[PDB]
């Protein structure tokens, strides 16, 4: 199609992240002189493909843009837009909290419920969201990773593969117990990424057994306000992480509330 190119059109560099991600590379398109992400393969070669054509369904200004493809012969290639921070979490930790202030938070947060309410729209879901997964560009522009996503109706569930090993700490309580994943999912895990944000990347449930996380869950208990944390954002924090998933708000509605707060400041 139109997005199939030549792999001969970019030039490898260095492999980035620290290769936390795989095998992603900081790449140049040298047509347009453009540092690009380039995404290669070295899973499975159909999985690697499907997420290559969901791309291409995806637009929206906070989710990574894809910019091309190398799928004829391999090695395949995805190629997408290059953020030229890094990822949120060590963006958080690292940065001036003078010019990265509370107003910048709800900046960030509307920004990526704004993703999820388009995902949430688009009957898609993420189920890895997270700091580590979003990206940060010039002027606190965020983007969600967008290269796990599954089709999925929004309203039903998906259930995942036997033995498949979850980030606990970002985990909904059903996907623990039943690896079931569903939008509301990724509202409980958005509601983990909004406590990441306001304590400047501090780890969940710090100290916390991962073995125990659920069974806490279970009792009810919940990660406390962080420090300077607005009540009206911790409130929405808990509403994330309702047991019940059809109690927890939408990214539509989610969306709206960031939208009035960060209107209001």
Request: with cysteine; charged share 25%; hydrophobic share 40%.
């Amino acid at each position: 199609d139109k997005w199939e190119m030549e792999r001969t059109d970019i030039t490898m560099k260095h492999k980035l992240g620290g290769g936390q991600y795989g095998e992603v590379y900081e790449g140049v398109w040298k047509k347009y002189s453009l540092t690009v992400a380039v995404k290669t393969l070295k899973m499975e070669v159909e999985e690697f493909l499907k997420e290559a054509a969901v791309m291409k369904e995806i637009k929206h200004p906070n989710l990574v843009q894809l910019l091309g493809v190398c799928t004829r012969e391999p090695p395949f290639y995805i190629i997408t837009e290059f953020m030229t921070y890094g990822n949120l979490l060590d963006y958080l930790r690292e940065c001036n909290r003078q010019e990265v202030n509370a107003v910048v938070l709800l900046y960030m947060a509307t920004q990526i419920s704004s993703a999820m309410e388009y995902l949430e729209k688009k009957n898609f879901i993420h189920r890895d969201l997270a700091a580590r997964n979003c990206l940060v560009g010039e002027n606190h522009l965020v983007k969600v990773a967008d290269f796990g996503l599954s089709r999925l109706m929004t309203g039903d569930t998906y259930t995942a593969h036997a033995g498949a090993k979850f980030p606990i700490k970002w985990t909904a309580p059903e996907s623990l117990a039943y690896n079931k994943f569903s939008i509301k999912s990724d509202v409980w895990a958005f509601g983990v990424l909004l406590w990441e944000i306001a304590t400047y990347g501090m780890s969940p449930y710090p100290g916390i057994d991962l073995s125990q996380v659920y069974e806490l869950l279970e009792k009810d208990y919940r990660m406390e306000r962080p420090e300077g944390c607005p009540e009206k954002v911790y409130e929405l924090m808990r509403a994330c992480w309702q047991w019940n998933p059809s109690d927890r708000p939408s990214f539509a509605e989610i969306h709206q509330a960031f939208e009035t707060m960060f209107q209001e400041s």
